């Protein structure tokens with residue numbers, strides 16, 4: 001038996017996947033997916049906002065039951081928690097000022113100030129490959145502070161999910177004078193294989209129900225109808 005109310009944690013600072021509208025209500029693709037799956041699962045769902053780096057600890061502590069927050073499915077995370085089937089693809093890419101020669105390389109980022117989300121796969125990658133080697137990698141409680149430090153010049157570059165940067169910043173007025181700096185960063189190990197619903201390992205029935213709802217809403221075309229609100233491309237991937 002699934003719980004009468006499935007509590008879903010999300011970090012609402014990652015448009016267009018999860019953010020807040022003017023009323024403070026949860027909006028974005030993650031929210032739409034979550035709500036549609038819950039509908040099909042015939043359970044009530046209650047969204048819970050928290051910082052991104054608090055989601056997996058909250059899940060483990062049973063303060064929430066699920067995470068839908070562009071949570072990348074990684075080898076390392078799977079040693080701690082479970083995942084539903086893939087919700088959508090997620091690649092990492094740097095952003096910087098328009099015209100920046102910055103590339104996702106150690107040589108290019110020497111003496112540069114680079115922002116990453118605390119508890120993200122991007123922080124993991126940046127800390128290991130760049131911060132130890134002298135690059136000023138700065139971790140942030142949330143992505144909106146990163147964008148703001150970038151636009152104010154405190155940061156030279158930021159590393160986050162490509163689609164989030166693109167739709168949530170670059171294509172917005174705030175990011176008109178900014179661009180991707182270099183191609184997406186390739187690293188299977190660190191960045192994983194798309195995003196999924198984060199779940200406790202022993203909640204097998206809940207995972208199965210999420211997986212069932214997801215397959216069904218993909219199959220009947222509801223996934224693509226919801227995605228078109230945000231994207232003119234195949235957000236799902238392969």
Ligand SMILES: NC(=[NH2+])NCCC[C@H](N)C(=O)O
Nearest residue numbers: 011014069070071072120121
């Ligand atoms: N709602 C968010 N802030 N999501 C951040 C996700 C970034 C990256 N995909 C990760 O799992 O670490």
